[PDB]
């Protein structure tokens, strides 16, 4: 049999098309199983890879409704960023769940046949993938494959946030584009956890959303007086690591010229390169496409980096990811439950008055995709 | 008796007097030497806290030929920054040297009596310096207080940045404004021991000083090929640390971006999200007081951070920071030699002329401060 996977293709004429291929379905070998995929996040490193630096304005529709295809141009300038993807058809989606529909031979296989099971196998926009057994999670008795969906990318992340917190040595942590499924997640470890943290949104919305599941400091970055709020938060909370989803533009620097302030309130002599307290900030996604700026209004013991969540397991190891994991099982519907404005079908994904919405990456507006939807 | 020393002091009042201060000279405790300064370094760190935040356009001159003031205007933005130093009657001078005229009498402060040493004790820009004995290096036979006045900062931060290097498994290493004195040393240790060397430059000329001095890989800033010409030093030196004096501007994250250019040359597959190969960037000096400005498309795997000597040679323990500092010793002459364009009294710190050119950071214009000369 043959069943649908969505393609992502860059070619080198600067041309991106998006289909739904064709393509013929895998029995398992013996340490695989056949998954029948039922949902799966479409997530911004998703986005990422599904529109590369092709310019959305530029789309346009053909194909059929059930056959869609979506062109569009990538702009000269972006042409280098996509290199290393040229003419490559890429199959797009990091995670998802559905059901085991065929189990190989082996005794870890069968053991799922049948099972509703999250994976991160990527290329789970695909009606079926065939993926190892070892690289399932059984879902709780109960949790449909929409419960399951996004038990990987932002469940481990808000998870590794806390645990890279700890293991760097600080207290508390701030949290930016805070109204995030992500950051509701987060909020909610911290909260249940006693840590400190300061969440940071753009829009009084967001604020609210965060507010009303019970979020202590919520510092909205467009308020005429956000350094004088953050910098109280930031003494209120004594946090002196952050993650930051923007990346580009100022926020990073004014968490780190806040977190400077802070810390010297409590200064007892005077330091000549400010606070030996170390000051850390991830850039751990890229939402602000605009250049990084800030000055150096916070002494010399700071760092900015990027971070990612598969290095960071690996750093962990596999024990210590198990039982991270193990938490997120066990509040899947809680903790780490996830909203989403709506559930599409693979076709829908190159709607482009879908596209129009979901590629926004607005609050409250993350799409979950059912590769199967309706059969 | 009582000597001379610099004083910086920035006020609640928004301004900045540098003098110099009548201070009575002790007598050293067991444990502790007396040194006649001879030869202290104006170095980035100590024109920092010598004027602070001041807006030295507005410096004025008062006082006496031998005992000068300045007096000049810290603006309210800056005043912040100076709140824990206000109405502090600061000492200038990270490091110095000089003769032990008096010694304590434990037999450590004994051992120096006469000896020419250097100290990082802070408070250098004095004609006597009252220190404990143990933080004192004794310098080579046939060294001048002059030889030795530099043997710590910029030496230490030389051998440091390879330590590093090291430490964080890098092989090889850029550095910017090369042709600092510093950058002169850092040139020769990695010329010597075989290390791989990226240097950036801002001008021409420093790249002609370099060249000469036989720095392999030198790339200009200025050039309209810099990008291209820095790729190819890292994709021939294989180096992803770098150590960056300016700090602000786009020099930081032009090495980011070049080194993962560089990286990629080998890429044997697509990764989502670049090389996974760790890129750091330190940026240990302010130069470019403007604002750190980067495009962020050299992946996830970097970092950028601030780099403080004290705190390094912390971490590397007493043991090993003296393994650094008996090769600074032997090597004081050649590898680490440090050039001076004028060496100027205690007085002369404090005259507007001498401040308009060593205040410029410019290269082989770092000034020498002899606190003794002229005086009984
Ligand atoms: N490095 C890593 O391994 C991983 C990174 N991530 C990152 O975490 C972040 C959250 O993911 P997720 O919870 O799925 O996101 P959501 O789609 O659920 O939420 C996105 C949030 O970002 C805000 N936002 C969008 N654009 C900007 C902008 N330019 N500046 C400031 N805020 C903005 C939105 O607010 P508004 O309504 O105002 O648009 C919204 O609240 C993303 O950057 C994602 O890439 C997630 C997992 C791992
Ligand atoms: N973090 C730490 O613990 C320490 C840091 N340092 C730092 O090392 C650096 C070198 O010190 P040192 O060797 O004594 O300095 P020097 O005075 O010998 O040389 C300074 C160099 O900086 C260049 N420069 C000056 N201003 C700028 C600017 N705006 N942008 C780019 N380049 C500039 C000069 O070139 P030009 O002629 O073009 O002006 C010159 O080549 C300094 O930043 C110093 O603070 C040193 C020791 C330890």
Redesign the pocket.
């Known amino acids: 049999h043959s069943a649908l996977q969505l393609r992502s293709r860059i070619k080198s004429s600067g041309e991106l098309e998006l289909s739904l291929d064709s393509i013929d379905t895998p029995h398992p070998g013996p340490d695989e199983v056949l998954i029948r995929i039922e949902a799966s996040?479409l997530?911004?490193?998703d986005l990422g890879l599904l529109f590369g630096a092709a310019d959305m304005s530029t789309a346009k529709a053909s194909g059929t409704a059930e056959r869609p295809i979506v062109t569009a141009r990538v702009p000269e300038g972006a042409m280098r960023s996509m290199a290393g993807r040229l003419d490559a058809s890429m199959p797009v989606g990091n995670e998802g769940a559905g059901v085991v529909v065929e189990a190989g031979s082996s005794p870890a296989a069968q053991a799922l046949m049948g099972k509703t099971v999250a994976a991160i196998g990527g290329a789970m926009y695909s009606q079926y993938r065939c993926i190892p057994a070892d690289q399932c999670l059984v879902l709780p008795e109960g949790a449909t494959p929409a419960d399951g969906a996004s038990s990987f990318?932002?469940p481990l992340?808000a998870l590794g946030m806390v645990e890279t917190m700890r293991l760097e040595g600080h207290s508390a942590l701030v949290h930016?584009?805070?109204?995030?499924?992500?950051?509701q997640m987060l909020n909610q470890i911290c909260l249940k956890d006693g840590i400190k943290l300061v969440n940071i949104?753009?829009?009084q919305?967001?604020a609210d959303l965060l507010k009303a599941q019970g979020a202590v400091h919520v510092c909205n970055?467009a308020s005429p007086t956000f350094m004088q709020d953050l910098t109280e938060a930031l003494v209120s909370t004594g946090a002196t690591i952050a993650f930051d989803?923007?990346g580009?533009?100022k926020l990073g620097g004014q968490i780190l010229t806040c977190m400077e302030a802070a810390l010297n309130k409590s200064a007892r002599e005077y330091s000549r390169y400010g606070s030996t307290t170390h000051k850390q900030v991830y850039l751990?996604?890229?939402?602000?496409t605009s250049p990084t700026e800030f000055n150096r209004n916070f002494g010399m013991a700071w760092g900015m980096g990027?971070?990612?969540?598969?290095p960071?397991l690996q750093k962990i190891g596999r024990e210590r990811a198990n039982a991270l994991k193990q938490r997120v099982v066990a509040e899947l519907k809680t903790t780490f439950a996830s909203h989403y404005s709506k559930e599409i079908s693979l076709a829908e994904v190159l709607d482009l008055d879908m596209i129009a919405v979901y590629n926004?990456?607005?609050?409250?507006?993350?799409y979950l995709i059912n590769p199967n939807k309706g059969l």
Not at 176 to 181: C, K, L
Not at 306 to 310: E, H, R, T
């Open positions: 996040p997530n911004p490193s990318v932002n992340t930016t584009a805070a109204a995030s499924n992500l950051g949104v753009r829009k919305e967001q970055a989803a923007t580009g533009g751990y996604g890229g939402l602000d990027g971070w990612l969540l598969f960071f926004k990456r607005a609050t409250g507006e993350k």
